[PDB]
What we know:
Chain A: Component of the MCM2-7 complex. The complex forms a toroidal hexameric ring with the proposed subunit order MCM2-MCM6-MCM4-MCM7-MCM3-MCM5; loaded onto DNA, forms a head-head double hexamer. Interacts with CSM1 and MCM10. Chain A: Belongs to the MCM family. Chain A: It is found in: Cytoplasm; Nucleus. The structure is cut from a larger assembly and holds chains A and B. By secondary structure, chain A is mainly alpha-helical. Chain A has helices at 8-14, 16-29, 44-70, 77-90. Chain B is largely without helices or strands.
Amino acid sequence: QGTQADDLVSAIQQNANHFTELFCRAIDNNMPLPTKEIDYKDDVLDVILNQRRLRNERMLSDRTNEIRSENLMDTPPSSMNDALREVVEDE
Amino acid sequence: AKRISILSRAQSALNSLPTFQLILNSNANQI
């Protein structure tokens, strides 16, 4: 194509222990939603991980809702939501 | 103050924020 690409193969071959975690981060960033639903025939690890994901979503939503309920300066909607998600995911 | 020091400077366009000092005034009886 003509675009410039780093030698990912050589970098993986030299420092593979780091690139395992890098690939896991990249995969977790772009993970499709499951078409199947959780049933009683699923693994215990799968339902534990599903409950952990639902818990993470619920604490994120609860912290965002509490901070919005505070209204700590009573004031740009999109910049407000950006700073809001920034403070919520940090706390 | 951390909630104010994030939601303000990112909207009215690294920062380290120390522990705040409590200053408290009273109008009660003076010993």
